[PDB]
Design a protein around this nucleic acid. Structure first.
Lengths: 198, 148, 106, 202, 177
RNA sequence: AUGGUGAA
RNA sequence: GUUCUUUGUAAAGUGCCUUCGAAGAGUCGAGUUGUUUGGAUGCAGCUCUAAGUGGGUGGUUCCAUCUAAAGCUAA
RNA sequence: GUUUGACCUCAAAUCAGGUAGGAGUACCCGCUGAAUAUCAAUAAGCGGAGGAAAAGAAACCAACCGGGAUUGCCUUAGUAACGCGAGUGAAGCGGCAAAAGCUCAAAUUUGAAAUCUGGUACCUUCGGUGCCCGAGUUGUAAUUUGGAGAGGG
């Protein structure tokens, strides 16, 4: 059997299912040298002109229910990044994705179990976890790639779920839905919120 | 130890004055292919009274045509041209015509400021900034011609 | 061997330019090539095969890829029973632990 | 090092020192209310032009890190040291004359303020210089609970509101290299780029 | 134009500057193969007046030939044999010494679409021009053939063998003269 | 004489 | 013949006036050595190597005719 | 900078788009080539093309009241000339067949490398267009090839 290192270099695994798998990431390397050439030329207009995973998702998850297998880690990473050299735009996008998912969950109220813990507030719909709203005191490149893949998957997941603005400046099926219905709660500094009074 | 007509190169403008000359020349970068194409497309769309453009002169044949007419005020010459005969006579021609000339190391460096991979020579005829050009010419003269 | 050479000719500056063929009008007039290119682009726009850059800016401006197809905690609560909380002596051998807290805010 | 750097430093320092001197003279003359030898007796702030209301409004402070060629003067050095803003109070009548001086060296809603407070999370704690994180709310109670702050959320609310923790907490609380990172910095330089009588630029 | 200056400078072949240039270039070439691809000609004026143009389709080759079938003819034959897919148009001398003589030959590729669509150069694409040096149709070949006008080339004006055949044939008409 | 054949 | 297009202050020609007005170098040439011619020419190894109102080919003071050392082209 | 870029040079890829060998050979072109003058620029050998090949529009022929691309025939002519011995042996003019002139180097498009190869999507597909990539400034297009030619009115 071909060793992992040997197979990676050629591109322990079965050669039958790996040889055929040899078929833009590589082409993107040319952009670095083009940018270096533009910098050497001393003119930025050419650089501006030069500047101006759906396929892998389907094979990994041929059907929407199959996403649930990795949704655990996907939501874990997304929520971890939502509260965390990652660019600020990536953090904002991760937070927005999590907020949209939470809003959709609240719309359907598809929640069954919850557990507040030291690690974080656990939830069940599928189980997912989110850390507290406090600062978090490793090679982030792997984390960045995992976040990108999970965000790409969650984009399609949210699109499927949805198919089936001054607040931005401030921010039956189960007993959970059956209970607390019409019980409008008021939350203090620790539904109406006192924080909005500020 | 070579004939005097050779080895006139390897004596070149100093780092500071060379950098100043490059900075001055970068102002008059000719419109690259993309910029000219987009500007022409914009003009055509607008159509669908004009000032004379200013840019550096770099073509060796074009520069030599401008040279000996006394129009060229300052000419830059690369010292690493493989056919040295193309540039052996240019300093003497400039001296005879009284046109200040400056030898700058690197044909690639000379061409990098004119949107070309390489450029044997570069010359300026028109200016936007005349005082700066005159001061640069005087500095180049005092630092190159009076020394070597 | 490489004796100095005398600038017997370059020592006197050329008083007058050597060339001829007085300045063409095109040097004092906008280039005709620019006008030709502009009119060619205008013709292309008329034929509808060229999009103006302003329209390109507007044109510079999510699907069901699957459709129908055939293919835990460990009691680490913030207010757990005292038995769950590891004793201080055993914390040295432990080298996440359940801990007792007054409330969620603490 | 070449003389050009020191020459530019001296020229920029002289220019900015004269600019600060005119601002200080104008402020001193305005304090006397003798609007007979000054261009503008009133005060303005620029977002567009906006009048500087006497209300002690509170806004976030940002560092611009420049002009670099201008060596920081002694007055600006002291002002930044007191405000500890050297590293890269309120808008009162007595604070404006000092804020305007450091204006070239420096520049919200609940959403931004809450996130900033809960993310930065500086807490002076005993080694002595520890400032790591908002570790636990009990730390605030122990160190600051005597003032009526049971958690960091109280500090956030009192900062957003016109409370006392806004003042008390003062004693308790593209960026890369390589070829790929040069184009973004060059683009941001356009946004990166001052009369004494002109309004304060925000 | 500058090309006039280049021609005038090249006229004084024995100048100390051209001597230095030649002795440097010959030494530089001595470290290279006998036949190799040249990035650009060392005598732009000569190549330009010989019909060479700096466009996709033209190729410059430098070949070394033993001193002492002319040397230029041998160089052309060698480059044609090596460059079977290219057509030899013309060549010019570039250097000489006591041991070797160097010539530069410019070649045009008829397969390149640039040459095929070039109205001023597509003529070489005709099959009748294959291996011009082989038949001595080049400038050096024609000169060696004695092709020219006047009494000095009466016996070799056009074809040294053809005249012998013509003067050896017996023309007989249907009605004898 | 020209060009080839085999033969230690 | 039939039918759509041209266009763009686009490209040429005629006569006049006006200001300018480039020309294939290790090439021509001489020397020598091999070669061809019934031609003394040409071809070829090598020392040297030419000028721009210049150079080549022919005769009694020179006069007649072209502008080589690049190439394409049916009959 | 106890670094990072511009090129130039040199290698490689089961890279993409291309061409080269060889066969035939009466004629064509070049090299070589026997049995000091003669068989002889023949015989044989090698290399390179087509339906024809080569040559071709004079640094020509002539010394005339001049002709004006190359090529083939008659004539010039078995003459001039030579080896003056056996022998070799032209060419202008004249008549006929057929006729076509052109393209670069050379002096600035510099008020716009205006040029071209390749990739991509279409259409009216021996090609055209929008975009991109690369070559080109050590010169790609137009304007001039001595009959002159070029900037202007």
């Amino acid at each position: 059997f071909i060793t992992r290192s040997q197979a990676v270099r050629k591109l322990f695994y079965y050669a039958k299912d790996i040889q055929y798998l040899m078929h833009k990431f590589r082409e993107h390397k040319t952009f670095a040298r083009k940018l270096t050439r533009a910098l050497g030329r001393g003119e930025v207009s050419s650089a501006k002109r030069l500047e101006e995973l759906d396929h892998i998702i389907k094979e990994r998850y041929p059907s929407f229910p199959d996403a649930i297998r990795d949704i655990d880690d996907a939501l874990n990473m997304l929520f971890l990044f939502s509260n965390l050299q990652v660019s600020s735009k990536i953090i904002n996008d991760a937070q927005k994705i999590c907020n949209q998912w939470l809003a959709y969950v609240a719309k359907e109220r598809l929640v069954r179990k919850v557990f507040v813990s030291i690690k974080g507030v656990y939830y069940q719909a599928v189980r997912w976890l989110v850390p507290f709203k406090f600062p978090e005191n490793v090679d982030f490149r792997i984390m960045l790639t995992f976040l990108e893949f999970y965000s790409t998957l969650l984009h399609f997941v949210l699109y499927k779920l949805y198919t089936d603005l001054k607040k931005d400046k401030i921010i039956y099926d189960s007993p959970v839905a059956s209970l607390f219905s019409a019980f409008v709660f008021y939350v203090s500094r620790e539904v109406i919120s006192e924080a909005a009074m500020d | 130890k070579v004939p005097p007509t050779i080895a006139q190169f390897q004596y070149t403008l100093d780092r500071n004055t060379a950098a100043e000359t490059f900075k001055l020349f970068n102002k008059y970068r000719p419109e690259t292919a993309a910029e000219k194409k987009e500007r022409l497309t914009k003009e055509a769309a607008a159509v669908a009274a004009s000032p004379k453009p200013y840019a550096v002169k770099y073509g060796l044949n074009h520069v030599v045509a401008l040279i000996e007419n006394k129009k060229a005020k300052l000419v830059l010459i690369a010292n690493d041209v493989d056919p040295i005969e193309l540039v052996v006579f240019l300093p003497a021609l400039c001296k005879k015509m009284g046109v200040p000339y400056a030898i700058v190391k690197g044909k690639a460096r000379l061409g990098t400021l004119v949107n070309q991979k390489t450029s044997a020579v570069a010359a300026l005829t028109e200016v936007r900034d005349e005082a700066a050009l005159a001061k640069l010419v005087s500095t180049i003269d005092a630092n190159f011609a009076d020394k070597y | 061997p490489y004796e100095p050479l005398i600038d017997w000719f370059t020592r006197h500056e050329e008083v007058m330019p050597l060339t001829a063929v007085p300045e063409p009008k095109r040097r004092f007039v906008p280039s005709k090539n620019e006008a030709k290119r502009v009119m060619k682009i205008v013709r292309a726009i008329r034929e509808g095969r060229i999009i103006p850059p302003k329209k390109l800016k507007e044109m510079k401006e999510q699907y069901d890829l699957w459709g129908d197809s055939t293919e835990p905690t460990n009691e680490e609560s913030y207010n757990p029973p005292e038995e769950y909380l590891l004793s201080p002596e055993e914390k040295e051998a432990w080298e996440f632990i359940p801990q007792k807290y007054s409330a969620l805010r603490k | 090092v070449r003389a050009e750097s020191i020459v530019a430093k001296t020229l920029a320092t002289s220019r900015e020192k004269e600019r600060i001197k005119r601002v200080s003279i104008l402020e001193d003359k305005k304090a006397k209310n003798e609007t007979q030898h000054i261009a503008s007796g009133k005060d303005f702030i620029l977002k567009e032009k906006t009048t500087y209301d006497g209300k002690p409004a509170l806004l976030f402070i940002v560092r611009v890190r420049g002009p670099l060629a201008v060596n920081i003067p002694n007055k600006a050095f002291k002002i930044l040291s007191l405000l500890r803003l050297v590293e890269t109070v309120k808008l009162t009548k007595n604070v404006y004359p000092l804020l305007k001086v450091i204006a070239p060296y420096v520049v919200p809603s609940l959403s931004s303020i809450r996130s900033l407070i809960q993310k930065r999370g500086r807490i002076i704690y005993k080694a002595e210089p520890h400032e790591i994180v908002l570790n636990d709310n009990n730390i605030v109670e122990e160190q600051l609970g005597d003032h009526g702050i049971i958690c960091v959320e109280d500090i956030i609310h009192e900062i957003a509101t016109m409370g006392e923790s806004f003042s008390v907490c003062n004693f308790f609380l593209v960026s890369g290299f390589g070829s790929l990172n040069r184009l973004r910095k060059i683009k941001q330089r356009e946004a990166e780029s001052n009369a004494a009588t002109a309004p304060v630029i925000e | 134009g500058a090309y006039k200056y280049l021609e005038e400078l090249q006229r004084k072949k024995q100048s100390d500057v051209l001597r230095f240039l030649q002795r440097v270039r010959v030494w530089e070439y001595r470290q290279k193969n006998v036949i190799h691809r040249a990035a650009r000609p060392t005598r732009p004026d000569k190549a330009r007046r010989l019909g060479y143009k700096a466009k996709q389709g033209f190729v410059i080759y430098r070949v070394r030939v033993r001193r002492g079938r002319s040397l230029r003819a041998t160089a052309e034959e060698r480059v044609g044999r090596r460059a079977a897919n290219l057509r030899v148009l013309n060549s010019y001398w570039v250097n000489q010494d006591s041991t070797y003589k160097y010539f530069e030959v410019i070649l045009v590729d008829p397969q390149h679409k640039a040459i095929r669509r070039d109205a001023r150069y597509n003529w070489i694409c005709d099959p009748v021009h294959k291996h011009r040096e082989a038949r001595g149709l080049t400038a050096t070949g024609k000169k060696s053939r004695g092709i020219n006008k006047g009494h000095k080339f009466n016996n070799t004006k056009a074809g040294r063998r053809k005249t012998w055949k013509r003067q050896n044939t017996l023309s007989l008409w249907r009605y004898r003269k």
